[PDB]
């Protein structure tokens, strides 16, 4: 039985975790960029007339209204889900940490080294009595 492997395990876990973090970040950036490019078509500085551009403007206004309805619906769903998640977090807190709540405390920081406090007080009293004479 031994527990020396904990250090090297820590090093390896930290390395692989950082690798996973950076990998997921890069993949997320790539996937979100490609999703936006598929859904956000860049506008054009030429090729459309005034009537064509205003027709495209009204059509894009309708499409933006529709996709913003979708976004607000999913945002409301996410808000409800996050409220439920917070409620479940409170529930599991009551389930488990109702006993662990008083565990966290810092004590024995000052009086642990007050052995000479009585000696210091008596030394001060002796000094005062010496000053009296």
């Amino acid at each position: 039985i031994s527990a020396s492997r904990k250090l090297q395990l820590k090093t390896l876990m930290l390395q692989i975790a950082k690798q996973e973090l950076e990998r997921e970040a890069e993949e997320r950036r790539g996937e979100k960029g490609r999703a936006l490019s598929t859904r956000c078509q860049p506008l054009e500085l030429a090729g459309l007339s005034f009537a064509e551009l205003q027709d495209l403007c009204r059509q894009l206004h309708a499409r933006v209204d529709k996709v913003d309805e979708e976004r607000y619906d999913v945002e409301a769903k996410v808000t409800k889900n996050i409220t439920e998640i917070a409620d479940l977090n409170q529930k599991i807190f009551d389930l488990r940490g109702k006993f662990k709540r008083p565990t966290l405390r810092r004590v024995r920081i000052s009086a642990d080294a007050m052995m000479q406090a009585l000696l210091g007080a008596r030394a001060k009293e002796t000094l005062d009595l010496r000053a009296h004479l």
Binding site: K10, M13, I16, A17
Partner: protein, 160 residues
């Protein structure tokens, strides 16, 4: 590993003063570090640290390999610096939760001991007797056949 040597290189002078006081207390003059079991506990309790008497029993049961009571000051200093609490909470619970989110390739609400073995194999490291057995045994300490989030935390809680 090399962490003990690095700690020896970064010897904190604040604790070095206490350790030299321990040197003077133990060495009563031309003394070869006889390793008195009660002296170790008295020094550990004296230095303001909170050594578990469990760790004092550990020190009692893990010294004097030469059999004559003489122990090198390098090893004794290493044991004293390591047994002293020098760490800050071992990262954060939020960071550990994020790491566990990373590690759940199975996406089944937890990780697996063999999944940990495979991933550590992907890290490109040689496995030996220090590895393999006790690592996976202590990953799923409750032995559920799978390492849950609470088991993941308790495996490497307070670890840097």
């Amino acid at each position: 590993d090399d962490i003990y040597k690095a700690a020896v290189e970064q010897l904190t002078e604040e604790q070095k003063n206490e350790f030299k006081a321990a040197f003077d207390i133990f060495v009563l003059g031309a003394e070869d570090g006889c390793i008195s079991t009660k002296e170790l506990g008295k020094v550990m309790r004296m230095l303001g640290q909170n050594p578990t008497p469990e760790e004092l029993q550990e020190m009692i049961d893990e010294v004097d390999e030469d059999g004559s009571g003489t122990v090198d000051f390098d090893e004794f200093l290493v044991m004293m610096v390591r047994c002293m609490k020098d760490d800050s909470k071992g990262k954060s619970e939020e960071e550990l939760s994020d790491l566990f989110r990373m590690f759940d390739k199975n996406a089944d609400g937890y990780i697996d001991l063999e999944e940990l073995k495979i991933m550590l194999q992907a890290t490109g490291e040689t496995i030996t007797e220090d590895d393999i057995e006790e690592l996976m045994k202590d990953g799923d300490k409750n032995n559920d056949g799978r390492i849950d989030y609470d088991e993941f935390l308790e495996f490497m809680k307070g670890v840097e």
